[PDB]
């Protein structure tokens with residue numbers, strides 16, 4: 408209920424995606440197809456593709472489930488398909504390597520269903536202490552876990568962060584100022600990229616409040 | 617000869633994606649799945665998804681071919697697959713509606729192979745004079761054709777724009793300053809987002825010069 412949060416800007420996204428692409432250039436891995444993990448990897452994938460000169464980008468949606476009693480986590484490809492990717496070199500891309508569960512599944516899935524010559528994985532960020540698996544490439548190493556708010560995720564992240572606060576509330580009527588206070592106290596954010604009243608209005612429409 | 621080029625910033629991308637999402641909210645179209653047209657629609661798709669609250673994003677790669685003698689254009693899905701999307705409402709997303717050839721194909725493809733309850737199309741921008749088809753939703757109407765440099769496309773676009781200049785060199789050469797003045801002369805860009813020497817270095821590595 409008190410969470411380290413880092414707001415990531417577009418400029419940083421560009422800077423990261425570019426640095427990630429540089430490593431891949433320098434390693435001279437010739438990428439024929441990029442497989443983006445949706446939704447997190449879509450944006451980083453397009454950027455890396457721009458820098459490297461990759462024209463074929465495909466994507467697979469990975470869901471993240473938890474079993475209520477056991478707290479067992481299971482990553483799972485939603486809407487699975489197969490394509491013939493032989494004689495092609497695949498680069499899989501995601502936003503961040505946190506646990507490594509998703510890039511583990513993706514590599515495995517891609518190798519069984521797409522049948523590429525080679526597969527390498529790449530994420531913008533990589534959390535050393537938390538990652539069971541290390542991606543072939545990453546732009547930035549994180550030695551201390553935090554939640555990273557990406558510029559393409561601001562709405563959803565803020566909705567969740569706000570909700571964590573509202574489910575412990577004096578209740579029902581929402582003082583925007585108390586909320587703003589709590590957001591600073593809990594996450595360290597004085598100035599959310601999306602203003603909190605816009606967030607609240609949206610949570611209402613999505614009837615979460 | 618001159619090409620009208622407009623450089624589009626991330627802030628504008630955000631502003632557009634958001635406005636596009638607002639239209640869709642206001643029309644009360646309940647989107648279950650977003651199908652992004654790769655590569656152009658990937659980024660806009662992630663953003664619209666953030667704003668609307670859509671969790672499932674799939675993508676199909678559309679290629680664009682021209683036959684050399686007839687100048688006949690043909691859009692074509694590369695790496696086709698099928699998934700069962702029945703009882704779902706699909707939103708297809710691309711960056712811009714220029715000719716309409718790609719969103720025409722995507723709509724037709726998605727309805728034949730995915731079998732959704734309903735399909736609607738949406739792009740950030742829409743060029744009135746050029747579009748044979750009009751997307752269900754768009755953020756911005758363009759009444760005068762130009763080429764839009766998107767922030768996820770800066771490298772590739774500049775590589776091409778530079779190459780259009782280099783293939784009419786007077787001599788085997790490449791004075792960076794000549795290039796810079798030609799770029800202003802031809803496209804109206806004094807300050808390309810990626811500096812032109814970086815572009816040249818990259819064209820060399822890609823064996824284009």
Ligand SMILES: Nc1ncnc2c1ncn2[C@@H]1O[C@H](COP(=O)(O)OP(=O)(O)O)[C@@H](O)[C@H]1O
Pocket residue numbers: 447448471482501502503504505506507508509510511530553554555556
């Ligand atoms: N610390 C974090 N900051 C931002 N997003 C995260 C973080 N941890 C997980 N996520 C989101 O959850 C998804 C799955 O996480 P995980 O299964 O650990 O991925 P990976 O296999 O890349 O480590 C990521 O693609 C990302 O969108």
Ligand SMILES: Nc1ncnc2c1ncn2[C@@H]1O[C@H](COP(=O)(O)OP(=O)(O)O)[C@@H](O)[C@H]1O
Pocket residue numbers: 656657680691710711712713714715716717718719720739762763764765
């Ligand atoms: N004026 C333009 N500015 C930027 N990109 C363009 C333009 N026209 C075409 N493109 C690129 O070419 C792709 C295909 O164009 P087109 O077949 O006309 O698409 P649509 O079916 O969306 O009109 C687009 O997704 C876009 O990436």
